[PDB]
Amino acid sequence: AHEVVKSNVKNQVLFNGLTTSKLRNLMEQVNRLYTIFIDELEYLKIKFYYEAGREKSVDEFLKKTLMFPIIDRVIKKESKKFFLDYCKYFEALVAYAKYYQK
């Protein structure tokens, strides 16, 4: 989690100018799912595609984290604990993105 965010600081920009205000809707999605269903994970995947489409930097962010394979493997596993582990990883990524900024 830390490794990717610290190593994606290129020359200063983060993922070519990533800022958390672009991640608001994803954050709300993750929080809503954290409070709580396969189809919900499906629309979750779709929303990563959505926000990664809104900005190119976000697409590069989700690529350099391998988010899409991770989410696919989450949906395959269907185990609640592993989804919460994904939530922890996503929260860690957001926090480290917040730290390393302009």
Binding site: R24, E28, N31, R32, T35, E40
Partner: peptide
């Protein structure tokens, strides 16, 4: 219904 408990 896919409704959350919080509105920001």
């Amino acid at each position: 219904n896919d409704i959350a408990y919080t509105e920001t």
